[model samples]
Each structure stands twice: as C-alpha cells, then as structure tokens.
Target: EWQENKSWNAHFTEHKSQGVVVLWNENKQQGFTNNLKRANQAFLPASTFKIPNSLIALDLGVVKDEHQVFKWDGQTRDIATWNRDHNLITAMKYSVVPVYQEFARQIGEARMSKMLHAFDYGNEDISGNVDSFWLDGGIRISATEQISFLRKLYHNKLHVSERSQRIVKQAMLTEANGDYIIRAKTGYSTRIEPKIGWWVGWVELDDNVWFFAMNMDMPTSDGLGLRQAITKEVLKQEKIIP
Candidate 1:
C-alpha cells in the first residue's frame, strides 16, 4: 500500500504534480505522491543512470579505480564543473556528463547492453547512440524502479562483484554527519519539454537504511532544489533524520 501526504502535495503546487517513494525495512513504505500514475510511469534515467553506469564501468575494468582520471577534452561548456578533468568520484560528484559519456563509448554497446540486462535496469534498452542512451535514447525507468535498483546496491545484491558495488557506493557518498551517511545521485532531463527532475538515493543510519526516489515536472530550473528539499523534509517528518 502507498501513502501520500498532504505536505508533499502542497510542496508540488508550482510543479503541478510530483511523486515520492520511500522504502525502509521489509514492511515500511511511505511517500508523498499526488500523481500515483506518473509515479509508476517510466521516464529517461538521465544522469541518475550514472549510478549503474559507474558499477558497470568499475566491473569491466573501464578505469583502474575511483582515483583514475579522465582528462578534460579542453572544450568550454555551459557548466563550469564539466570542463575540467575528473576521476570517478569527482565525476559523480559534479554530474560530469562528458566524463561518463566517454566511459560509455569505451564500454561499447555490446558490453553495456549485457550489463544493463544482467542488472535488469530500466527497460534495458541502450539502442541508438550509446553516449546518449540514458539521456534521450531508448532507456527509461520509473521512480519505483529507481528504488529497487538502489536497494540492491545498498545490500550488495546486484550481480556485479562486491568490490565494484563497494567502489560505486563510495563514489556516491554525498555527505556524512556523525552516524548518518547520505548517498545519492540527481538527474535532470533538460532535453525535453516539461523537464524531468530526479533526486534518488538513500540515507544510512547506524542500523537502518531508508531509500527514496523523487521526481517532478520542472517548468523551470528554479524548481531544481525542490527534489532534494521536499525529500529531506519528508525524511525529517518520518523521523529518518534528526
């Protein structure tokens, strides 16, 4: 059963619609989802796809480890962070598209397709351009699927080697305060109308992990922070954080 909260609905007023899904333990599930249908609808994975892509890269020996660097191609881009050299950790931290795209090309369609299938990733369709598959190509995944994938990663249950899983998890670490650690990835599919915004990941306490996936229609870039803001507020309300 799914539970939608009023505050979550109010939070999505400007965006018109939004969906959030939280999963913890074997029996607890809660979220603020005004549009239940869209919550289950699949959309481009965007940069959040980086989570699994990182796993595949590490597993296939794409780069030696998180310390291996991919030098900047020396091209100026819209986002300053994407213009410099990046290793696995920095790339994931900055959401460096070009760096990961290069990794994808190096990985190739054959191996990528195989890995996605093995992982049972959203739709698992990497057809068309390999570099842009998760962006605008054929790959799509719902917020629900996002949680499923993250749960596997959290428990070291994905088909990838434990080392690969650990490395990717390390790279995903965004913050740690005392006993709480936040590991997450954000995605924005700006190539289309009614841009899709995503903030997915989980928070780990001393004894439990709470997984969350939030998405919404972003009429403008101003609403980008809503993804994290709303999720954090919900987590606080659920007493997942202090």
Candidate 2:
C-alpha cells in the first residue's frame, strides 16, 4: 500500500522545486510516497543509468574488472573529476559522463537494446545514439520503476550475472558506517528542457533495506541540489538517517 504522506510536500517546496519520492520496502510489500502521479511519471534517467551501465559493461566484458582503468583521452570534460582517468568505482564516484559515454559506445546498440529489456528498465527504449541515450532522453524511467529495478538488484534477481550485480552494488556505495550504508546515485538532465534532477537508490540498516527514487523538475541548474536535499530531508524524518 502507498502512504500519501502529504507532509513530505514541504520538502519539495522548501527547495523551490516540484517532484516526488517513492519509498518501497520489499520485505514488507509496503510503499510510501509524497506524490503518486509524479512518482509514476517517466523522465530521462540521466546519470542514474550508470548503475545498469556498470552492470552491462561488466557482464559484457567491456570492463573486465573493478580495477580496470579507463584511460583519460585528455579531452577535458567540464567536471574537474572527469578530466582524469578512472576505473569503474572512481568513474561512478565522480559520475563521469565521458567515461560512461565511452562505456556506452563500446556497449553498442545491439547489446544495449537487449540489456535494457532484460533488466526491465523503464520504457526499455534505447532509440538514439548508444552513447547519449540515457543522457539525451532516448531512455526514460519512472521513480516507481526505479525502486523495483533496484530491489531486483538487491535480491540478485536481475537477468545479469550475480557477479556483475554484486560489483555494481559495491560501486553504488556512497557512505558506510557501522550503523547504516547509503548506496545511491544522483542524476541531472542538463541537456533537457526544464531539466530533471534525481537521487535514487537504497539504504541499508540492520533489519531492512529501504529502496527509494526521487526526481524533480530543474528550472535552474542550481535546483540540482534539491534532488538530494528533498530526499535526504524525508529520509531523516523517516529515521532512515541519523
């Protein structure tokens, strides 16, 4: 069941942005959300696609291992961190657009097509250039669908090899202390009109793993922070964080 938690609405308003958050507990078969309509609205996944991209690359052998380094082309990306060389972990850490773009180029359309469907990624549309599809609106995923996909990865139920999912999960780890671990990804659709920003992933605690996906309209690039701010505020209220 979905809890229409209206109080969560203030989180978005405070950020001066409009969006939704979908939090689902797989074990309990229960869910909570702030806006049901927007939760189901599909939008470009942006850099959040890196989660599955990492899996596809590993499964396809495009990247042999976590330690495999992708050489910097010296083309200099706008993100300072992207200008340097990176392996999968570091690449995902910096959300390096070019490195993942390079991964997509190597993934090619045929395999990417098959992988998207196999994973049941929202819309499963990889209609444009392989390298920019996720970034360019060629593929879109809903906040609702994101949690389901993430749960599959958590349970190792995805079609990809267990080994690949395991590695990608490791890469998603954003913070870890003895009490809880936050494994997540932030996405900003800089190329799209009105833009879209996202923060999606699961939080692990002692007794349960909480999965969530949040996305918002970005009127200004500055609103990008709202993606996580809103999500973290709710997470804090829900006691998912200290």
Candidate 3:
C-alpha cells in the first residue's frame, strides 16, 4: 500500500530516482520498496548515530541508568540548541552533543569502537569516533542497511544485555497519533559542502512493527523538515493514517 503527494511531484520528476524508501515486517518476513536505488549502499548517518551510541553507553555502564544526573553547560553554542542540565533520556530527546560526548568519553574510544564493531554495524569501515560527530570523518549506510540495523534494535538484538536493550528502546521512543509509539532519531550535518537530511524511526502498532528510514537533500535552512513531511505522507499513503 503506497501513494505520493502531488506537491512533491515536481521535485520527484526533477530528482528522478535519487531517493529510496523501504518497509518490512520481520514477523512475516514481508517487505516492499520504492526507488530503492542504493538499498545496499552506505552514507553518512548524521545524527542517527545516537541510536547506536545510546546502546553502547548502556552496555558499558557509562551511566548508572538513563536517569543518571548529567548537567548541561547552559550554552546554545551548538546546533542542537539544548539548555542547561539533561539526563540520558533527555539527552537523547534533545540530541544534545555535550551529554553524548561525555557519555562517549566514559565509554572510552576503545570500548565504544569494539561494541560498534561487534554489532557489525551497517558498514565495515564505519568507525566509532564520537569526537568527530556523525558524518565528520566517517559515517555511511544504505537504506537497506539502515532499516536492517533498526530492525535489529526493535528485536532487541543490537547491543547491550536484554535489559539494557529494553531501556534504550524505551528512552528513544516518542509519541505518535494515538497509542502507537514512534521510536526514532534524526541526523543532519553540513560542512564545506551541502549535505542531506535524515529521519529514521519505527512504529509499534500493537503487535505489528514497522521500521523506516528517510533521507532528503534540500535547502538547509528551510522551515519544513523532510523527515516530518515524509513520515506523515508515508503513514497516510500506507493507510496507517486517515
């Protein structure tokens, strides 16, 4: 089940096949696709790195728990625009860099690298250097790889013990229309050159599960983010929303 918005029709016509979308149900081993050009390729993960980072922190015992006391430096110096003070869950919700950096440091480069590698992350060359931030020196993944990685998370197979995995998922989960829980994270970056935008999340509709990842390249400062628009559009198209 799928459909497209006519508003984006012109953009799709111009970009042709530059984008990709995929949906899968692990229980049924069923799936579908649209413009899955680089389904198996890799690209910078941007902020999506937080998903894996949060899991690593939990497994390493860097913080006692997601509620562990962690204060903010009270500076809007970075792009995340976070204020003073934040716990692990808040850090994830706000996507604050300082808290994540601190947690990563606690996890240590060596252990973090080991855990990221142990998961066999989406790419073989993807390094776990929290200092560089996502998309700095290394970070990349294909639509297929991203979705697969998320699927592993939903199934409690990414990293950490069973308890830790459950905690991470609970912390990352966000609100949907009704009882549905949208467990997701967004990532964005741009240095010398222009970069794409990303929105990846999963939906738990009762016993059913849906994992999706969306990345778009458009004007950076635009008000309407592609991820939000795509999320709504996809849900409506799939008949998940009326």
Sort by TM-score, best first: what order?
A: 2, 1, 3
Q: For each candidate, what is the lDDT?
A: 0.83, 0.89, 0.67
Best by lDDT: 2
Tens-digit lDDT track of model 3 for 1-242:
33333443333344432344566655567655555454455667766778888888877787678778787676666555476777878887777877777776787767766877777776645454556546575656766777878887778776578877788788777776665778888766564234666677777887788777766654454622555666556666776556
Poorest lDDT segment (10 consecutive residues) of candidate 1: 23-32
Query: Which candidate's TM-score is highest?
Result: 2
How far off is residue 160 in model 1, in Å? Answer: 1.0
Prediction 2 TM-score vs. true: 0.96
Candidate 3 local Cα displacement, residue 117, angstroms: 1.6
Evaluated against the true structure, the overall lDDT of model 3 is 0.67
TM of each candidate vs. truth: 0.92, 0.96, 0.84
**Which regions of candidate 2 fall more than 4 Å away from where they truly are?**
none
